[PDB]
Design an enzyme around this catalytic site. Structure first.
Site, PDB file in Angstrom:
ATOM      1  N   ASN B 190       0.807  -1.231   0.000  1.00 37.05           N
ATOM      2  CA  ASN B 190       0.000   0.000   0.000  1.00 37.05           C
ATOM      3  C   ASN B 190       0.835   1.275   0.000  1.00 37.05           C
ATOM      4  OD1 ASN B 190      -2.060  -1.752   2.337  1.00 37.05           O
ATOM      5  ND2 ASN B 190      -2.469  -1.536   0.131  1.00 37.05           N
ATOM      6  N   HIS B 192       3.146   2.210   2.147  1.00 37.41           N
ATOM      7  CA  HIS B 192       3.427   2.700   3.488  1.00 37.41           C
ATOM      8  C   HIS B 192       4.742   2.057   3.942  1.00 37.41           C
ATOM      9  CE1 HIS B 192      -0.278   4.778   4.806  1.00 37.41           C
ATOM     10  NE2 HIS B 192      -0.747   4.196   3.706  1.00 37.41           N
ATOM     11  N   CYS B 227       6.294   7.467   9.243  1.00 40.35           N
ATOM     12  CA  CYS B 227       7.253   8.156   8.394  1.00 40.35           C
ATOM     13  C   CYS B 227       6.642   8.016   6.980  1.00 40.35           C
ATOM     14  CB  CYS B 227       8.641   7.519   8.468  1.00 40.35           C
ATOM     15  SG  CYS B 227       9.799   8.086   7.182  1.00 40.35           S
TER      16      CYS B 227
END
Ligand SMILES: N#CCc1ccc(O)cc1
Ligand SMILES: N#CCc1ccc(O)cc1
Lengths: 268, 269
Positions: B190, B192, B227
Site C-alpha cells: 500500500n 506505506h 514516516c
C-alpha cells in the site's frame, strides 16, 4: 530444494511472502534477485562447498581467491503474486579463463510455464588486494565436475541484451536520487553490501509515475566497485527511448563509479 | 502453515535464508520481525479475512477502519542460524475496548525448545482521517470467535518489560545516525513504510562495537506517527545502564517531530 537427477543443476520452490510484494501485489525485482542468490547458495552447499566461502574450491581458499559478480541480467515476463509458488532452477558453466557464468530459469510451479530468466558473469578476485585475475587451469579443472559439459544457456540468442556493452551516463542526468546509504539490513554475513541493494539503489532514481504505469521487464547491471558500509551513493537515470533508461551509481563525493546499468519497462 | 486443531492459533515453519543472516551467521531481529508479520498475515487469511485489508472485519471496512501497531515487544533467547528451521505460533486476543493484542512463540523445530517470544498492541484507526478510537461492541463481537476466550499470554509474568511506559530521550543524545530515508524496498503493497524498517532505523544508532560484542535480547518499540515515503528520519540512542540497556528516539529530521520511542537490552556474547 534439491539437485536434479544428473547432479548438474539445482531446483527450489518458494512461496511469495506478504512483505516481499510491492504496489501491484506482486514480488519486487529485488525479492526475485534475493531468491536467485538463495538458490545459488543452496546449489553450492549441495555439491560440497563449505559455508565459510561461496563456491570457493580448495585451491581458491589457499590462494585467498573469491568469486565476485561482474554483471547481472534479469528478464521477467510475469511477477509472482503474494501466496504464489515460484520454482527456480540454477546451474553454472565455465567460460574459458574469463570466469564463470551462473544462469537461472523461473517457472510458475502450478502451470510449469517459464515466467522469467536470469544470467550472471563472475570473476576471480583476491579477497585482500581486490585484484582481478583470469581463472587458473588448476582451479577451473576442480569445478568442471559440477557443470554441464555442453553449453546450456538461459539466454541462447547469439549477441543478445545480456551481452551488450553499457555506456557511461553523461551529466546532467534527467533524474536523480542523492545521498543513499546502506543500513545494517543491507549488509551480508561478512559485512559487505548485498548485491541486491545496488539494484534497489539504481531503481530509486526512476520516477514514481513510470513505476505506477509500467512493469520492469529487463535489467542489466554492471558492478565496477563496491560501496563500503560508510559510503554514500548517488543514483542517476536518463531516458534513452516501451521505456528504456540508462543508469549510473557513483560515490556522492568524488563521483567514483560503482555501477552502470540499463532497464526496459513495458506499459501496464 | 496451518491453524491448530481448535482453530484458535496458527503455526508456520521457515527455513532461514543466506541473505536473512547477519555477521554472527544468525538471523537478524529484522528477519525475525518480518517472519512474525508473515505468520500474522497467514493466520488472518486462514480464518477468512480478505487480502484487501489486514484482519478488517465487515463493520471495519464499512466504517473505513484499520488496525495499526501501537507497540511491538520482542525477546530472543537464541537466534536461528542459516539453514535452521524455526516454527512460529501466533494468536490474537481482545483487550476490552482499548484494542487487540497479537502474540507469538518461536521454537527450534528440531528440539521443540522455545527460542523467543513476542507481543504487540494494536489500535483501531480511521484510514482517511488517521483518528484513533476505542473498539466498538459490534467490531469486538465480530472477531471474538477467532480468539481464545481464557487469557493466553506470551508474556504472563506479573512484573514483565512488555507493559512498561517509555521515557522521551533528552538532547543531547549519546549516539546518532542522521538523514535516514526509506527506499521502495522499505514500502509495503500500500506504499506505506513497513513497521520492520523502523526497528532497523532504531538499531542504526547503536555503535558497531556493541553489535560486534553483544547480542540483542529484548526490544520494545512504541509507534507514535508514520514516516512518509518522502520523509527523512534521525535515529538517537543514549546508554541507560554485563548487560547494556539503551533508550531510543526516532524523529523527523527537520522539525524533530517524534515517530518512535523504544528501549533495547543487550547481553555480552
Ligand atoms: N548466485 C548466488 C549466490 C551468492 C550471491 C552473492 C554472494 O555474495 C554469495 C552467494
Ligand atoms: N502481525 C502482523 C501482520 C501485519 C503487520 C503489519 C501490517 O501492516 C499488516 C499485517
Amino acid at each position: 530444494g534439491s539437485l536434479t537427477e544428473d547432479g548438474l543443476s539445482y531446483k527450489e520452490k518458494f512461496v511469495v511472502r506478504s512483505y516481499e510484494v510491492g504496489s501491484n501485489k506482486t514480488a519486487t525485482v529485488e525479492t526475485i534477485a534475493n531468491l536467485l542468490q538463495e538458490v545459488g547458495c543452496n546449489h553450492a552447499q549441495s555439491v560440497g562447498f563449505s559455508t565459510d566461502g561461496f563456491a570457493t574450491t580448495t585451491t581458491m581458499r589457499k590462494l585467498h581467491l573469491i568469486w565476485v559478480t561482474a554483471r547481472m541480467h534479469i528478464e521477467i515476463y510475469k511477477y509472482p503474486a503474494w501466496g504464489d509458488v515460484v520454482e527456480i532452477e540454477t546451474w553454472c558453466q565455465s567460460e574459458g579463463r574469463i570466469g564463470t557464468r551462473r544462469d537461472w530459469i523461473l517457472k510458475d510451479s502450478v502451470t510449469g510455464e517459464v515466467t522469467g530468466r536470469a544470467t550472471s558473469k563472475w570473476v576471480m578476485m583476491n579477497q585482500d588486494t581486490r585484484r582481478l585475475q583470469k581463472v587458473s587451469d588448476d582451479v577451473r579443472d576442480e569445478y568442471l565436475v559440477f557443470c554441464p559439459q555442453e553449453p546450456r544457456l538461459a539466454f541462447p540468442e547469439e549477441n543478445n541484451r545480456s551481452l551488450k556493452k553499457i555506456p557511461k551516463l553523461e551529466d546532467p542526468a534527467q533524474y536523480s536520487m542523492i545521498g543513499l546509504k546502506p543500513r545494517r539490513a543491507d549488509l551480508d554475513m561478512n559485512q559487505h553490501v548485498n548485491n541486491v541493494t545496488y539494484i534497489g539503489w539504481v531503481l530509486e532514481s526512476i520516477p514514481q509515475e513510470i513505476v505506477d504505469t509500467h512493469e520492469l521487464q529487463v535489467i542489466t547491471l554492471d558492478y565496477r566497485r563496491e560501496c563500503q558500509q560508510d559510503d554514500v551513493v548517488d543514483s542517476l537515470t536518463t531516458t534513452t527511448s516501451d521505456s528504456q533508461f540508462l543508469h549510473l551509481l557513483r560515490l556522492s563525493g568524488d563521483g567514483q563509479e560503482i555501477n552502470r546499468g540499463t532497464t526496459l519497462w513495458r506499459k501496464k
